[PDB]
Amino acid sequence: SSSVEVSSESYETIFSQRIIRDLQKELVVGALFEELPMSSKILTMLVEPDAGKATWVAASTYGTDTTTGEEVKGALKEIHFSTYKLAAKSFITDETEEDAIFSLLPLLRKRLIEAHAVSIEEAFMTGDGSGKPKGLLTLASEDSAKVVTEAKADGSVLVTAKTISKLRRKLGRHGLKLSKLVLIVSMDAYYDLLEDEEWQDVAQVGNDSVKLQGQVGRIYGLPVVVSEYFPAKANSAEFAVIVYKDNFVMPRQRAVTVERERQAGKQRDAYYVTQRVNLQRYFANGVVSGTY
Amino acid sequence: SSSVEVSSESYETIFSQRIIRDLQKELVVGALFEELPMSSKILTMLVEPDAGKATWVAASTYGTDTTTGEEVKGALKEIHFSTYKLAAKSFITDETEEDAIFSLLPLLRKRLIEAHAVSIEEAFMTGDGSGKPKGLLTLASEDSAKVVTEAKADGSVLVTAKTISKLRRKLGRHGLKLSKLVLIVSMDAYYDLLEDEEWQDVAQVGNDSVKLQGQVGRIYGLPVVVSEYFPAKANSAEFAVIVYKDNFVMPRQRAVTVERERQAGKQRDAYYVTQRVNLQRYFANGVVSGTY
Amino acid sequence: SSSVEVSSESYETIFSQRIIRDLQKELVVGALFEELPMSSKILTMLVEPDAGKATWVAASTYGTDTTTGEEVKGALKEIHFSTYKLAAKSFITDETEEDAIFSLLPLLRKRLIEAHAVSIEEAFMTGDGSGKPKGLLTLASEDSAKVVTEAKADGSVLVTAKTISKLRRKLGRHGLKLSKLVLIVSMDAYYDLLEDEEWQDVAQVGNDSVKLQGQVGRIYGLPVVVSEYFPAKANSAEFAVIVYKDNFVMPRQRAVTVERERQAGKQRDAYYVTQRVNLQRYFANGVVSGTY
Amino acid sequence: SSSVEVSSESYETIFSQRIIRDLQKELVVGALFEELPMSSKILTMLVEPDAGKATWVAASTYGTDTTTGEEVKGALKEIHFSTYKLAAKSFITDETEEDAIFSLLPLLRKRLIEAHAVSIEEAFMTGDGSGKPKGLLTLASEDSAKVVTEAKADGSVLVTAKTISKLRRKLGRHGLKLSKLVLIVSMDAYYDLLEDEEWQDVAQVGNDSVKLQGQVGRIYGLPVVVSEYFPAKANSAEFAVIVYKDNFVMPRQRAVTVERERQAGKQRDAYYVTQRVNLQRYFANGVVSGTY
Amino acid sequence: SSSVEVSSESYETIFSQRIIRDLQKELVVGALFEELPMSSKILTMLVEPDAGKATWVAASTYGTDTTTGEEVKGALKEIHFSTYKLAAKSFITDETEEDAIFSLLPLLRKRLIEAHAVSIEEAFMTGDGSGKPKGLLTLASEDSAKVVTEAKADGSVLVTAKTISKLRRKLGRHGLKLSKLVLIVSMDAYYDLLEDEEWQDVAQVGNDSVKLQGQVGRIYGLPVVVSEYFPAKANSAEFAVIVYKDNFVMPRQRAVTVERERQAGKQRDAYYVTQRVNLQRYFANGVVSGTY
Amino acid sequence: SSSVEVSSESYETIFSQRIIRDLQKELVVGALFEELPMSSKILTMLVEPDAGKATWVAASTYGTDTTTGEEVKGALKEIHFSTYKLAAKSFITDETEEDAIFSLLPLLRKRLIEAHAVSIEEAFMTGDGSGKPKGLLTLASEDSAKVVTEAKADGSVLVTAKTISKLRRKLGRHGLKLSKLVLIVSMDAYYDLLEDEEWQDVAQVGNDSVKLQGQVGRIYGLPVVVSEYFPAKANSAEFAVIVYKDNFVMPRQRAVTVERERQAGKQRDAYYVTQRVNLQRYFANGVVSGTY
């Protein structure tokens, strides 16, 4: 009846009262370590490691230098945990905040913190270490630690299940355990439709329940971390396996705090979120990936 | 003997009493949602889910002027919920009813309703949205979502079970689950008997029981909703896979009511049966279809 | 020494006493439904299942005249179940019975009833249905219903077991159930020795018994009704699979009776045997056979 | 020194105290039926099982002339079961008995009876039926039954278990059972270690014991009567599978008796053992054998 | 520096002490039977099995002259068991015993007895039957009894498990059981590694226990008696399988006694170790070996 | 702004700190026997195992003179248990020690003893035994005993699992058992995925635990002493399997001790570690390795 430019504009318009989030993916992997508070400029350590060496000496007296005899070493290595600053800044103007909707500022604050955390997780996963923490698929990669798939447990010809097993027993050479798997979402999809020598398929069987879905999706009974924080290289899959109780800790030189001023050349409200963070490192075989 | 046009018409004949219904098929799929009453003629549901986010900042001073900018945000996105009208009339006259049958109308009101129910399902199940409730295949198919089978879960070649698993995983990256499957009766026939890995049939073993068939007809323990409200593309399949308790609601802006009049030019009996409906939508990857 | 033409005929020979039947099997399959007595020359009855229908109408008015709404019809259809006559007749002479024996007749009456009973089953199983009851391999097949195997649930390669399952599914599409299965004795002896991937055979486990044999030979746990009244073709196997207690009734307008006269020009005994029976039909998927 | 014809004959010489018998197999097959006591020369039985069947009549009339009228029959067939003579005799003289052992005669009398018994079994197992009982195999094989393996359940290729099955389902179709099986030792000695699809053998499983053996040495749980009294052929193996409690009876006009006379020239001693026996023949297909 | 002829010889140096006996293996295989004491140089006995027979007689008289006269016979046959001699000696001297080890004789006497016991086992395992017992493989192989595996239970292509399987059948044809099997060390190692249709070896599974090693090394749940006293034929392998509790007794006309003399015209110490043994032979199908 | 060579090295530095050992493995394979302390220069002792054996005697008198003479012996043969010397010294001075760390000697001394323990285990594992003790592998392989696989109880074909079983039997044909297996890590990776009849592997199953891993890595349920002190021969594996408590003893004529002097021309800190050891041998078949 009424058209626009009659009286259409005078009727009820509902707005989204209660909204959903931007970003609904959990933040783990980058923080999946002991989170240790720190305040120091640097932290420096040393290890024993050893002395002497000893051999086989024919004896028959007390004190013998007749044959073989004195043997010593001292050794090394000092190591320094090098700390980084990671931080963010954001604007809002009174100009934007004042219309008739003043509910924006409360909402905004809880996006900022959530957003600083995202950038940390991505920085820990992929990051070169300049201006950012020590990577996880940089220190376990082919790029700067030279770790690919295990070829000391490959005769010729591999398969996708096999690769996980092969990397797992590379960790037990390094003497450590496995306690979580971090896998690409595609990989886990493939392993959900598991191929087994049970021949029932533990994604389903005949009688299906939450027990089965939650068993197939765990490999070796362990939390698979489904994550999307991986480049796709080619048809290759990247994996990160290591222990997560005997591995690395996140020393945080400043725990996340939100800092705030009004000043940016007028007033205006300016927001600072600031953390300072790193990864520990002791070994380059101390975390293991492999390229399919 | 007794021949017709002689004396055959003065003896016995039987007539029916009680009568089979038209369509003994259960109406579901289009009525497989929660039914929410609405009194509001439009809903303008502005979503509101975020303010600020994060940044990477060096900090260590009260006011920092050297690092990155700050962030301040509004929020988005208004959603207009628009209802449509579905309804029909039936014109009848006493003049046709006049013979010796007068029990026609007590069945007929409930034939018209049952029939009006069919078209409600067909429109709910498949539909553009223009003058009809939002369509279920359509909203989740290539037509207006570009949602087909997940190509990031397949190398090439997809067997019938294997498809379902690609769609199952697609669902959980959304944040939603699966609790029933809607399949075509001809597709449903290769799941009624399926050739399976236990190598005995888990439809029937050697010693069929209603239990084994009731387990197999639940793909993943989840009921398959056998329906015949599906287009036919080719030897390609169609699926409707979603959760049916967390997805979309069916909002009914006028529930079905029967108005009755007797005015059409004389008397005459006039019936008007009228409803108003739509379906909710937030996302169109919140529902899943796919292409075999 | 003693031989024919001495005195051998005057001495000892022990001549016949007692007889064993003709056919030491049960007569099955025609009689496998309810058998209801009637007294009504024709069961004319009208079956009316639907009235109304309704549609989607956009309204915004009480009396909605703006678009058509009006939906109403009567329905159809009338059917007539017409009884047929089956009969058997015999005329003998006193001369044939007599030589010193006159006990033939009380036994003659049984054989007549029994042989009649056989024809009835012949007529129910295969029969054009005009003057006699309609078939069950002549009704239910390609001959007069277009009902064979279900090709739309085949993959490719029909094998015998597969054929029964596809056919089973063809029944549940129709809405009717299965409660007995009717099969060919030649096929039966190979449902008795069914292949199963249980892999020890459940008809000779290695802890062998009559139980396993009486299980395997009951396809789906429902009794196999061994029957052999089937036509020939090549080596196609036909089956009769239907619900046998929620379908057709056999209606009896005349119960078995023997009407006995002597007078036939001479005496003579004249024996007339009469029954009036039919088969019902409701739909052209009301019963299912399939061709292999 | 010491040689024969010195002092070696008065030295100890040990002679046999006890002996084995020639034959240590239990008799079986031909004394495995009912042993019916009898005293008549012949049993002449006439079986009369069926009289009357009538016809399906066309009705509204009693003493039909629109079809063939009222049927009645008498019946056939007289059959005569005639005993045959089995007699065996032996004779000794006082010259035969005397050596230095007088104690042979109670043993000889046992031996003759046993020896005669073998001849009864030999004839009952295979026998023309002319001055001996009819042979069980001589009426079950190709010899005059003309009953071999059913073509009607071979797609091509027969194996030993299938041949037994083929033979078994002939039985259930002549109205009889299987209650024992008679087989050939060489074939029985292949179910000693029985190949099967467990592949771990269901003859011995994992932990061989006597129980498993005496159960697997049966086919259908029913005792395999391990014998070697069948004739040689080639690589063909004939069996007998029939009921052994609803089958052919032995009518014994004389139960086995021991007769002793002395007289025949001088005295001297004579041992005669005589029985008069036959095997029934109710049907020529009332026993089933077959050619492998 | 110091060596023989300087000062090396004056330091304590450790010379021999503490003995170990010749052969660390149990004397069995010829000693597996009952050792029955006897005192009779030769044992002469008949074994009586049966006397007369009694052939079928037609009868209907009390002296049957119409048939062949009575059967009768004595009993055969006479058997001689002849003892053989086995002994060993040592002639040592007073000069030998004098001049290093005077405690040699208490050990030397034990070795003479023990060494004789092995030589006895050599005579029982394979024996000429001339001056020494009758052999054990000798009476059971082709050497003097023409017993190889039964070619009339061959299904073509004899394999290891099967040879035993045929051999067991040959046993039941004698009517004697199988209770242990005596094999060659090298075969026994392959039989320990039995491959069965579990396809995993029941030798050690994957879940080993002493029971499974103690189970594999039993064939048919009967223990194998592992031995080395066998000849190596060719590529053919000797097996010896019989009952070992209802077969051959070893009759001993003298038990092992140690006899001691000193004279030979001088003294000198003379040690004589003596036994007298024979081995029963009833049949040559009373012990069964074979050729591979 | 700041850089090194400005003030940075003096600004608040975390110097090196703490420690972790080298040889992050337990000493195995050398320590795997009874360790007997000894205090004797040599033990020179006679193997004592037989004294006479005699032979058979036909008798006929208390003595004989007809047959062979008598046996009686002392005993053969002397063996000498000889020690070797293993040892080394190490040189350090006060000049080296004076920097700013004086916790070096308390660590250097532990390392030295540990470093000596390694050169002992090395020599114990492989060695010529000439001035060191015997090589465990060397004596056992084909280098010095001519012992490879048991290829007189092997027919055709082998796998890794088989090669162990060939060795396993080879021990017991000297009466010896098994109580450990020694294996190369490269092989150990291949026993991780043990191929078995339960056909899921007992290393994962579907559900893993430390227990399954501890069953599959113990071949026969007995500890595999996993070690990496093995020579890498080629694509061949060596193994060492013998009994390790019913065989060889390791006799130690001097236990490990540390002697220390400070004088040799200057002072100077001098350490001497010295020990004396041998490994016994008794036969060349009393320790077994194998070439895969």
Swiss-Prot record, chains A, B, C, D, E, F:
Q: Which domain of life is it from?
A: Viruses
Please describe, based on the UniProt annotation, the reported consequence of changing residue 120 to T.
Confers resistance to Pycsar-mediated defense
Localization recorded for this chain is:
Virion
Explain what the record says happens when changing residue 190 to C. Answer: Confers resistance to Pycsar-mediated defense, reduced fitness compared to wild-type phage
| Task of the protein | Major capsid protein that self-associates to form 120 hexamers and 11 pentamers, building the T=13 icosahedral capsid which about 860 Angstroms in diameter. Responsible for its self-assembly into a procapsid. The phage does not need to encode a separate scaffolfing protein because its capsid protein contains the delta domain that carries that function. The capsid gains its final stability through the reorganization of the subunits that takes place upon expansion. DNA encapsidation through the portal triggers capsid expansion and the binding of the decoration protein to the capsid exterior.
How does the record describe its quaternary structure?
Interacts with the decoration protein; each hexon binds a single copy of the decoration protein. Interacts with the portal protein.
Name of the protein in question: Major capsid protein
